[PDB]
Amino acid sequence: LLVTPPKALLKPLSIPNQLLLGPGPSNLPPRIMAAGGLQMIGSMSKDMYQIMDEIKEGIQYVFQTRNPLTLVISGSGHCALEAALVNVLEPGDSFLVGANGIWGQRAVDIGERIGARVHPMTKDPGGHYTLQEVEEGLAQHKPVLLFLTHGESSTGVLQPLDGFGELCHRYKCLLLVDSVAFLGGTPLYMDRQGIDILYSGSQKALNAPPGTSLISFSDKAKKKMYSRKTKPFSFYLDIKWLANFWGCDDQPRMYHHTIPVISLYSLRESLALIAEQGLENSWRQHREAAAYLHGRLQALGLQLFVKDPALRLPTVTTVAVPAGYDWRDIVSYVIDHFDIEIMGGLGPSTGKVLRIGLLGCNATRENVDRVTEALRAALQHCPKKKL
Amino acid sequence: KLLVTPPKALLKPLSIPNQLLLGPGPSNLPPRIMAAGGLQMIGSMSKDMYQIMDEIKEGIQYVFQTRNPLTLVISGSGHCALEAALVNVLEPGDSFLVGANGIWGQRAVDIGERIGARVHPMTKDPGGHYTLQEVEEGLAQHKPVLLFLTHGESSTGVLQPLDGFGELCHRYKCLLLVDSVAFLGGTPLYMDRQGIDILYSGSQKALNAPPGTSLISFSDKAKKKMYSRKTKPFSFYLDIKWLANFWGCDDQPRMYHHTIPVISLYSLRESLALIAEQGLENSWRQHREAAAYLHGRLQALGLQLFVKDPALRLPTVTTVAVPAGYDWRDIVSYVIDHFDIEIMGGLGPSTGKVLRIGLLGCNATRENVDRVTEALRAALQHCPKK
């Protein structure tokens, strides 16, 4: 006992109630909370495998793919992205990146750590890519893989994906897409759109807690991952091992690492919620709830950051920071006086935007009113600073 | 035309069985910890989420006995903690010595090779352990930058003494990375005093915690090495400079890096609370007592224990030699089908040579030892003979 039992740890755990209207994680409805409080089962029991299997069907549904190599990564969005990158890229492979926000920048950082010859196409916070711009990119750097971000949480932008699959394949290159927008925004049809890898952190698209990530790989991608002459740099994210345990190959399942049993309860149950509601109904709900916010922000005299309404990520909306205010003051006001969490910017967008989130069953008209009164009080009572 | 209709399986209620988990972990969760798991979300970067991280950290300092400011939760499982440690400390080309006496050693090796280390295993059959003399011959021959040792071998049921190994490794200018699931039951662990430079565990293996989070600690010698390398480590997700910052271990303010598993952390904290109330000494007693009573009850069933020396027996995970004439799969399956009790066979080098029975935290009761003993007794009676 160099260290006595902590004093802080002898008090009951107490957490505040907060309405979470940032980019995610969001609040959890009762059913999903309940799943989180259930008892443990064996991390390699037949029921645990039955659950994984249902989850997998869920990921197939929410993504629209027949890919047998579909599975949950035992970590967050950064971990899914990495798993994808660490497997598909061999040290020395050319890697093209759609760097129009932080998630692009992250892709780049990871790709450099793992020895890829990274080639960013950089665009200021606000922008998106055209089939033409990507094609010039594909010609110039002859890459093995393209990263694109579908839903940009940094900038509030919704990248159209139609065409990009068939373009990348025509240049003998795969297409990795980071989507949080598959539930609200535009429909996603992986197989049809020709996307070769598609990933998301459960907590960003579903009403799920953080710690787990949905991922899917096309056969073209498997081919590339499974035929490389070097071993990928991680064992934790090694896809051969992971595919086996998740039941995506012929053989019996081997111990690899321990999956987060409890979260998987919740993940499954969240994939259930959407499975009942249906994709089409969920698209409507978000697109309707967003619009009403867009309208209510403008009535507060707030300028939306993404000028073209067609390029607006419904799940995460970006407001331009009003002239004469410190964005920190506003963000802090909304949390202190209304227990509402919003967010400023992130990476390139830092300090240029506010970020407001409408995620799943929190994408209500009521919550848009609650956050609209909060901002309206904040615009009223915060100081005018020299920016 | 949707390619894939809404799954039929997913329109039915989630239903799970009740199972007494007496394998190596995860174990069953007491009510308090279940409750924590069912609470509402808070901001993944709110001041309260930071207050919770900080308490957790104190917990890890207590359960490990360290003043190390570079202590934190890895946002992944034990393989992920080990990797984070290895990916940061080892630079491609560094000599790395490994105490390969079970699977976890073998995993260390696999990881070290993927990240370009010149790995040097000291291999020993399932059953064995290392002596200060054996390690020293190793330290001389391969002049390594780091040594991996497994404290509690869940593969073989062995309890590696750690005394001496810190001061030895430092005398040869090399760090000491230890994988311990035995800090709660078995032998006391005093990281700082034992000279251990890195120490990790998957919450679910030592605490009554759910999987998905891992406790880790680094000495200042280790920070020095991780923070002064000329190359970037191969992972961003486990990059320690970034992680140390977000977990509040350095001077600066906290930056978005990745999203920590809020809900699991509730549970992790609450489990570190449970032990904080019980106290380390009381927990050591409880496990060591509960193990002994099992050892005695298995022998009365005519079962041979796998680790011959009683001093080298990991209390938290016990290995029985598979009785002559029996398929181990039959027995394992009998226990689950007729008593809702989960035990395990072997793993890696130990595969098909052992059964593995677990006594973890508040499941380390005398009642559960009876329940599993009666299961095995019935299994010896109803399973095929040979």
Author numbering:
A (entry chain A): 6 to 392
B (entry chain B): 5 to 390
Direct quotes from the study:
Human alanine:glyoxylate aminotransferase (AGT) is a Fold-type I pyridoxal 5′-phosphate (PLP)-dependent enzyme, which catalyses the conversion of L-alanine and glyoxylate to pyruvate and glycine in liver peroxisomes.
In order to have a deeper understanding of the structural and functional effects of the S187F mutation on AGT, we have solved the X-ray crystal structure of the S187F variant to a resolution of 2.9 Å. The S187F structure superimposes well onto the normal AGT counterpart, with a root-mean-square deviation of 0.48 Å. Although the overall conformation of the two proteins is virtually identical, significant structural changes can be observed near the mutated amino acid as well as at the active site of the protein. Because of this displacement, the Val185 residue of the mutant protein also changes position, and its side chain moves away from the PLP. The small hydrophobic pocket that is formed by Phe187 and Leu188 can accommodate Ala210, which eventually causes a shift of Ala210 and Lys209 towards Phe187. Moreover, as calculated by Pocket Finder, in S187F the PLP cavity has a volume of 1073 Å3, while in normal AGT it has a volume of 949 Å3.
